[PDB]
Amino acid sequence: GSHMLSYRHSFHAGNHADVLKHTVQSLIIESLKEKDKPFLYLDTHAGAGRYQLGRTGKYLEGIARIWQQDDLPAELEAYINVVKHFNRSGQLRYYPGSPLIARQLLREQDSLQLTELHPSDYPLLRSEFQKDSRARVEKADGFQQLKAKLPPVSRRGLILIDPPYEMKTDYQAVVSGIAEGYKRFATGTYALWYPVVLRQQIKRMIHDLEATGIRKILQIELAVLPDSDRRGMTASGMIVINPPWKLEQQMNNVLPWLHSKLVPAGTGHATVSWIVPE
Numbered sequence: 001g002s003h004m005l006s007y008r009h010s011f012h013a014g015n016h017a018d019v020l021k022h023t024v025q026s027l028i029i030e031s032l033k034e035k036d037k038p039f040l041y042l043d044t045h046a047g048a049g050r051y052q053l054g055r056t057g058k059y060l061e062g063i064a065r066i067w068q069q070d071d072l073p074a075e076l077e078a079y080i081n082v083v084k085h086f087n088r089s090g091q092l093r094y095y096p097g098s099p100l101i102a103r104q105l106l107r108e109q110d111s112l113q114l115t116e117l118h119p120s121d122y123p124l125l126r127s128e129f130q131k132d133s134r135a136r137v138e139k140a141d142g143f144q145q146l147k148a149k150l151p152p153v154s155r156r157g158l159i160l161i162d163p164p165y166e167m168k169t170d171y172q173a174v175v176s177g178i179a180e181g182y183k184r185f186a187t188g189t190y191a192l193w194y195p196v197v198l199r200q201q202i203k204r205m206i207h208d209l210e211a212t213g214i215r216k217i218l219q220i221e222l223a224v225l226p227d228s229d230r231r232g233m234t235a236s237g238m239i240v241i242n243p244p245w246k247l248e249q250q251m252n253n254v255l256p257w258l259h260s261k262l263v264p265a266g267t268g269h270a271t272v273s274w275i276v277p278e
C-alpha cells in the first residue's frame with residue numbers, strides 16, 4: 001500500500017559514476033556552507049532518495065572499495081560520513097542518492113527543491129522528506145525546474161542536473177536547460193552529470209555548451225575503460241559551471257586515489273580541465 005513503502009533496489013547504485021558525482025556534489029555543498037547565508041539545492045532528476053544494495057551489484061566495485069579505507073582522502077570525508085550515517089551496522093546496505101547527500105549536509109537555513117517523474121521512485125522521494133520543512137518535492141519535469149525555480153530567494157545555490165540519458169534528447173535538453181537557468185541565475189553553481197557511451201555524443205554536447213557563451217566551465221571525468229563504440233558506459237563526468245574556488249584543486253588531489261581504488265587495472269583515465277575558463 002501507499003502508506004508503507006519499500007525502499008527501491010538498485011543494481012547500479014554506488015558505482016564508480018555515483019562515487020564521482022556525489023563526491024563532487026558534497027564538495028560543492030561544503031563550499032557553499034563557508035558563508036552563513038542560506039542557499040538552495042535544486043535536484044532536477046532526484047531519483048528515489050536512497051537505494052537498497054544487493055549479478056552482484058556495482059556498489060561492490062565502487063563505494064565498497066573506498067568507504068572503509070584507512071587512508072581515505074580528506075576531500076572524501078563529508079561524502080563518506082553521509083554513507084556511514086545510513087549504514088551504522090558497518091555493512092553496506094543502503095546507498096544515499098543525491099537528495100539524501102543534500103538532506104544530511106544542508107543546514108537549517110538552506111532549502112531543497114527536488115523533482116522526479118518516475119511513478120514508483122517519486123513516492124519514495126516524497127517519503128524521505130515528509131518531515132523536512134526545508135524541502136519541496138514535486139512529480140514534475142526536471143528541466144522545467146530550471147525555468148520555474150530560479151533564481152532562488154536566497155540568491156545562492158547548487159543546481160544538480162542528472163537525467164537518465166535514456167532518451168538521446170537528454171544530451172540536448174541538459175544544455176538548453178542550463179542556458180535557461182543560467183540566464184535567470186548567472187551566479188549559481190550548476191553541476192551536470194554525463195555518461196560516456198559514445199565519445200561523439202559528449203563531444204557534441206560540450207560543443208553546444210560552449211555555444212551558450214557561458215564562461216567558467218570545469219570538466220571532471222573518470223573513465224574506467226578507454227572510449228569504445230560497444231562497451232556501454234566506459235566513463236562518466238561532472239561539468240561544473242561556476243565551480244567553488246577549491247574544487248579544481250580538490251579533484252586533482254583526490255582523483256588519482258579514487259582511480260586507483262575504482263579501477264584495479266589502471267585503465268581509462270581521470271582528468272580535470274577547463275571547457276571554458278574565466
Ligand SMILES: Nc1ncnc2c1ncn2[C@@H]1O[C@H](CN(CCNc2ncnc3c2ncn3[C@@H]2O[C@H](CO)[C@@H](O)[C@H]2O)CC[C@H](N)C(=O)O)[C@@H](O)[C@H]1O
Nearest residue numbers: 012013014018045046047097098162163164165166195233
Ligand atoms: N541504467 C540504470 N538504471 C537504473 N538506475 C541506474 C542506472 N544507472 C545508474 N542508476 C542509478 O540510478 C541513479 C540515477 N537516477 C535514477 C535512475 N534513472 C535511470 N534510468 C535508466 N537509465 C539510467 C538512469 N540513470 C542512468 N541511466 C543510464 O545507464 C548508464 C549508467 O549506468 C548510463 O547510460 C545512464 O545514463 C537518480 C539521479 C539522482 N540525481 C541521484 O544522484 O541519486 C544513478 O545515480 C545510479 O545510482
